[PDB]
Amino acid sequence: SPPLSIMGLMPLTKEVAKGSIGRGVLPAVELAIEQIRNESLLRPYFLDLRLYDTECDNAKGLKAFYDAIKYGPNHLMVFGGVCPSVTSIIAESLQGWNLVQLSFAATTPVLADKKKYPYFFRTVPSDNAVNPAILKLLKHYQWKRVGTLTQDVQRFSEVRNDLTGVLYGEDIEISDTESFSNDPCTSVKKLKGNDVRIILGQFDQNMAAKVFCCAYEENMYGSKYQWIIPGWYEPSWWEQSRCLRKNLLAAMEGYIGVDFEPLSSKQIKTISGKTPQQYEREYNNKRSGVGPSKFHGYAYDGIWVIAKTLQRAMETLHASFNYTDHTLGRIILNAMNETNFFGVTGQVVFRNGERMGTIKFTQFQDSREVKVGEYNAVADTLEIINDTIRFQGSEPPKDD
Amino acid sequence: SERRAVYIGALFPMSGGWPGGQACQPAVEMALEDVNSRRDILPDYELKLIHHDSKCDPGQATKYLYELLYNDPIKIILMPGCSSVSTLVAEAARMWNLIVLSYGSSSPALSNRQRFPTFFRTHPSATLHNPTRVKLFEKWGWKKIATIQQTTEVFTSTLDDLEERVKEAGIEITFRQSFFSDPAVPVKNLKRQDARIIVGLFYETEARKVFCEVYKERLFGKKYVWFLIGWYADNWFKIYDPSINCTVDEMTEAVEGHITTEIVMLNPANTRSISNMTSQEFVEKLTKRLKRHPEETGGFQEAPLAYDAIWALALALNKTSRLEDFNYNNQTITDQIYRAMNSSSFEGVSGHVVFDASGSRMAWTLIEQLQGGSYKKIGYYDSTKDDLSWSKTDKWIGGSPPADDYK
Numbered sequence: 001s002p003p004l005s006i007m008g009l010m011p012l013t014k015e016v017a018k019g020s021i022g023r024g025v026l027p028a029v030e031l032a033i034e035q036i037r038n039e040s041l042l043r044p045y046f047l048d049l050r051l052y053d054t055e056c057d058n059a060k061g062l063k064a065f066y067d068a069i070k071y072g073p074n075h076l077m078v079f080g081g082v083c084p085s086v087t088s089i090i091a092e093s094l095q096g097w098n099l100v101q102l103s104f105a106a107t108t109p110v111l112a113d114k115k116k117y118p119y120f121f122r123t124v125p126s127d128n129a130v131n132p133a134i135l136k137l138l139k140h141y142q143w144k145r146v147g148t149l150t151q152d153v154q155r156f157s158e159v160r161n162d163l164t165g166v167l168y169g170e171d172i173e174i175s176d177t178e179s180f181s182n183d184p185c186t187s188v189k190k191l192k193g194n195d196v197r198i199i200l201g202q203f204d205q206n207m208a209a210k211v212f213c214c215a216y217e218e219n220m221y222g223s224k225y226q227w228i229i230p231g232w233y234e235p236s237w238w239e240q241s242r243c244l245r246k247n248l249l250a251a252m253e254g255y256i257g258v259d260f261e262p263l264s265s266k267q268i269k270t271i272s273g274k275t276p277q278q279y280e281r282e283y284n285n286k287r288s289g290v291g292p293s294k295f296h297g298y299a300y301d302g303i304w305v306i307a308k309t310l311q312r313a314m315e316t317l318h319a320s321f322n323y324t325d326h327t328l329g330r331i332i333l334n335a336m337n338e339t340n341f342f343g344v345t346g347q348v349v350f351r352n353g354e355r356m357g358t359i360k361f362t363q364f365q366d367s368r369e370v371k372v373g374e375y376n377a378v379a380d381t382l383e384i385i386n387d388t389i390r391f392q393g394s395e396p397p398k399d400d
Numbered sequence: 401s402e403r404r405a406v407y408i409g410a411l412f413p414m415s416g417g418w419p420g421g422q423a424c425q426p427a428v429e430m431a432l433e434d435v436n437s438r439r440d441i442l443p444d445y446e447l448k449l450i451h452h453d454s455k456c457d458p459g460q461a462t463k464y465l466y467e468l469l470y471n472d473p474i475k476i477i478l479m480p481g482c483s484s485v486s487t488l489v490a491e492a493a494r495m496w497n498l499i500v501l502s503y504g505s506s507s508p509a510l511s512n513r514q515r516f517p518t519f520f521r522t523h524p525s526a527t528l529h530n531p532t533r534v535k536l537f538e539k540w541g542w543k544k545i546a547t548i549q550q551t552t553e554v555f556t557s558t559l560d561d562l563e564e565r566v567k568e569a570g571i572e573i574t575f576r577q578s579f580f581s582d583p584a585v586p587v588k589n590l591k592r593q594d595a596r597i598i599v600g601l602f603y604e605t606e607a608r609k610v611f612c613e614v615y616k617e618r619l620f621g622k623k624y625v626w627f628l629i630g631w632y633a634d635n636w637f638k639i640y641d642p643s644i645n646c647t648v649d650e651m652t653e654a655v656e657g658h659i660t661t662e663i664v665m666l667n668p669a670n671t672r673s674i675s676n677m678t679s680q681e682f683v684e685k686l687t688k689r690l691k692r693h694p695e696e697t698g699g700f701q702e703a704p705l706a707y708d709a710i711w712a713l714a715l716a717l718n719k720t721s722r723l724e725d726f727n728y729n730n731q732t733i734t735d736q737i738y739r740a741m742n743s744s745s746f747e748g749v750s751g752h753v754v755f756d757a758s759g760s761r762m763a764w765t766l767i768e769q770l771q772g773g774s775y776k777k778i779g780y781y782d783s784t785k786d787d788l789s790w791s792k793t794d795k796w797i798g799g800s801p802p803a804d805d806y807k
């Protein structure tokens with residue numbers, strides 16, 4: 001039984017905050033590896049995932065990668081890369097060792113650049129994947145005029161920059177573009193003054209409470225307004241200075257949250273023979289004391305992408321690894337581009353290393369965010385959940 | 401009885417945004433020959449070079465840094481060239497307890513002791529222009545300054561340093577504008593606000609676009625003073641660009657009178673440095689080692705900084721003198737060198753070599769003014785000693801500098 005070695009790179013230490021992602025995904029990775037092994041899918045070979053702690057640090061992460069090359073077995077590909085700066089360093093260098101990389105948690109749009117990161121692939125949709133989804137939501141409700149409120153931080157300005165190209169050639173006007181660093185109030189007052197009704201917000205959890213307080217003070221809430229903001233904030237994020245909690249909740253009422261879908265809502269058998277719901281139960285059993293991670297499905301499907309890629313690569317060699325082999329690296333790279341199966345996160349397909357996945361729409365209703373719809377990136381289709389999504393008026397708000 | 405070999409792991413950008421290793425590698429090799437034939441420097445050691453072409457690419461540099469660190473011999477220092485390559489190697493080096501000495505990095509971000517703990521550069525930071533800018537505002541009595549920048553990190557970091565620096569001098573930044581590529585509106589607003597003393601930071605292509613707009617908006621005259629970077633190609637404004645509506649004459653009209661600051665990289669004087677060469681002798685010696693003319697040689701003007709980098713290291717290693725026992729797992733030797741490098745003081749081919757608290761080079765700046773479509777040297781400034789060399793060659797319409805406001 002010869003090994004098919006894979007370099008697992010992620011933060012694993014309890015001392016590192018993002019170590020919770022690396023640890024939360026391991027039970028899902030353990031489940032996928034265990035199944036592939038029993039079923040002897042890669043017979044006679046077996047999947048040999050070796051784990052190396054990046055510690056969510058540029059220097060430690062690079063040394064972890066360097067030590068894996070020096071002292072570790074001959075890895076065929078890289079699985080992981082969670083933190084943005086660490087992943088960018090490793091992903092940029094890949095061609096040097098003819099290593100294809102598959103990430104399950106690095107969502108930075110920067111990685112979509114195939115000139116700089118040719119050998120990088122990801123099962124998780126990037127931060128920008130919300131933009132084609134929002135476009136469908138705007139078309140669905142006939143919102144042709146929007147305003148933007150962005151935080152002056154790279155994570156948010158990258159998403160706002162991508163929105164320009166997404167809304168170009170479409171019948172959608174960005175009537176007002178506003179930026180802020182520490183206080184959103186001036187920008188919110190400018191949006192009110194320009195009579196903006198549909199707002200596309202891109203700011204962190206901390207700034208969101210400030211944004212909604214300004215919205216209450218400027219009366220930018222209720223039947224006439226629709227806020228479309230990030231959907232990745234922690235639960236009860238608002239509970240955690242001038243506004244009262246009741247006034248914040250009044251302005252927050254009806255906001256639309258946008259984020260990737262952690263698991264498929266379709267009760268259909270996936271590549272493993274299990275439904276997404278059956279997998280979720282198996283993961284929750286296996287995780288034990290370990291805290292769950294929203295990226296667990298992406299890590300699970302990630303392992304299945306690797307197995308299927310190695311299968312196609314084995315076929316290509318039969319039809320006719322030191323890091324020296326440019327050819328095998330190209331075979332693995334071409335094999336991964338062919339990926340097309342129904343996984344726990346939905347249909348697992350790549351468009352230039354980028355995941356064509358599912359985007360979740362939520363709406364804040366009284367006390368919490370409630371799922372209101374989903375966007376299928378493959379089909380470029382939106383499905384609004386009947387009798388979930390609500391508006392304070394008789395009709396959804398008008399754009400002017 | 402036997403001289404022990406000691407190694408440098410270098411990276412030279414022979415391709416890329418800055419193919420600076422083309423003249424810097426031979427300059428480093430000449431500097432190693434000169435240092436090794438001196439018995440007063442390192443009598444017991446022979447400084448040897450192991451290098452690779454970074455291609456001014458970080459992803460590429462990563463393969464070679466592994467090649468440098470994961471193959472014998474042990475290297476005592478790491479020498480990268482590009483700012484992008486230095487940001488990668490200087491942050492990673494801590495894990496192997498390595499001093500990083502750059503000869504071509506200008507990025508202000510590299511002056512960050514927490515992120516880059518063992519970093520030194522013979523190439524100064526782009527922020528060195530700032531004490532010269534503040535002194536020129538002080539000389540001509542201006543307290544209200546406008547700033548325009550292309551949306552680049554270097555320009556953002558340099559302007560952030562200018563804000564802090566202007567305040568320590570009792571001056572204020574009136575308006576700050578930025579553009580990714582098209583300057584029509586920022587130039588537009590500069591005229592609206594009646595901005596009078598302006599600093600503009602952009603690359604050469606963008607400077608042409610700014611000046612055509614400056615051409616269109618009558619934003620040049622006795623009223624206006626523009627400060628720019630002195631590293632553009634000669635007659636950068638007569639250069640033809642299909643994307644500029646403005647003409648050579650108009651553009652020659654707009655650029656007229658603007659001030660430039662640039663780092664002095666070769667001692668203008670005819671004095672002899674530690675090597676016993678004059679600036680002219682170094683230039684002549686370097687021209688000989690080259691396959692092609694200095695003109696088609698990348699980093700030809702940064703070559704003295706590369707030459708002086710080897711001397712700075714040699715002199716630092718001389719001050720410490722147990723080099724063969726260096727290991728990546730140990731901080732002992734590293735820290736002694738850090739201390740020795742930190743207190744560098746010598747005359748190099750580029751001038752007096754000293755580093756500030758952040759490991760960044762302290763140097764003279766050359767001040768120039770575009771007079772009759774030509775740059776005339778109006779002075780030099782020494783930030784560390786507040787020394788200003790003034791030549792009475794600056795020309796202003798109406799015989800005197802305009803002012804920051806209406807009067």
Ligand SMILES: *[C@@H]1O[C@H](CO)[C@@H](O[C@@H]2O[C@H](CO)[C@@H](O[C@H]3O[C@H](CO)[C@@H](O)[C@H](O[C@@H]4O[C@H](CO)[C@@H](O)[C@H](O)[C@@H]4O)[C@@H]3O)[C@H](O)[C@H]2NC(C)=O)[C@H](O)[C@H]1NC(C)=O
Nearest residue numbers: 434437438439440670671672673674675676677678679681
């Ligand atoms: C640094 O810079 C300059 C490089 O241009 C060097 O200065 C040179 O030093 C030489 C030292 O002598 C000097 O050459 C001749 O000077 C004397 C005639 O002026 C002559 O007496 C010297 O030779 C000695 O004389 C006897 C005669 O029998 C010989 O047998 C011996 O060889 C003795 O050396 C030299 O022939 C040269 O003129 C001078 N050049 C200048 C421009 O000043 C200097 O050495 C270098 N400095 C260092 C290395 O510290």
Ligand SMILES: *[C@@H]1O[C@H](CO)[C@@H](O[C@@H]2O[C@H](CO)[C@@H](O)[C@H](O)[C@H]2NC(C)=O)[C@H](O)[C@H]1NC(C)=O
Nearest residue numbers: 330333334335336337338339340350351352353
């Ligand atoms: C990568 O895969 C993509 C899609 O799998 C390939 O693009 C398809 O190539 C087939 C040719 O057999 C065409 O019929 C389709 O029109 C292409 N689809 C798209 C969406 O472009 C791409 O050529 C593959 N490249 C590789 C493996 O190098």
Ligand SMILES: NC[C@H](CP(=O)(O)O)c1ccc(Cl)cc1
Nearest residue numbers: 418481482483484504505506507
């Ligand atoms: N003088 C060398 C330095 C190299 P870099 O800072 O790494 O781009 C440099 C600085 C500015 C320019 Cl435009 C080109 C090169």
Ligand SMILES: *[C@@H]1O[C@H](CO)[C@@H](O)[C@H](O)[C@H]1NC(C)=O
Nearest residue numbers: 440441442715718719720721
């Ligand atoms: C180098 O070695 C010794 C020890 O520091 C010292 O006397 C000498 O001055 C140093 N070399 C130079 C050129 O200063």
